[PDB]
């Protein structure tokens with residue numbers, strides 16, 4: 001009886017039909033999202049425990065960081081559109097939260113150019129139909145789960161992880177219990 005509704009996860013009243021199998025929401029302003037990236041590597045360690053063909057999806061949210069929240073969601077869409085997530089994720093986290101040198105859309109663009117993306121290609125992607133559509137998709141997904149805070153992870157649009165119901169005294173025990181819950185829920 002280890003896994004129970006209300007302990008390591010909760011159940012959505014209205015499951016999201018057609019949701020991605022494993023969906024993470026984050027913000028570059030979000031302090032625990034910073035640790036999920038740099039210190040715990042939650043996404044990498046969850047991926048390791050899932051079966052060969054379970055796709056993970058990660059979306060940025062609007063509701064932290066004021067005006068910059070939307071600029072970052074659109075920049076994350078550009079990152080997804082170019083496949084450069086791994087080249088920009090750490091510099092964006094650190095520019096936002098560590099050095100606090102990301103204060104405008106132009107500062108975000110600077111991170112991409114310094115990471116090797118040509119400015120013209122960043123701008124074309126930024127203004128593209130693909131990126132406009134990715135932005136809407138990220139917003140709909142947050143609305144479909146009534147998202148109120150990050151970090152958050154949802155499994156098959158039906159179950160939401162509850163990290164506060166896990167053991168948080170040890171980083172690596174926490175990561176193990178978290179990943180193991182995702183695996184359990186994907187098989188339900």
Ligand SMILES: Cc1cc(Oc2ccc(CC(=O)N3CCOC[C@@H]3C(=O)O)cc2)ccc1C#N
Pocket residue numbers: 032035039040148149150151163164168169170171174
């Ligand atoms: C070892 C370790 C454990 C952790 O355990 C967590 C504790 C809390 C959360 C939730 C959270 O940040 N929020 C804010 C937005 O709304 C939802 C939720 C809330 O507070 O309701 C997530 C994980 C976090 C960091 C480390 C490290 N190093």
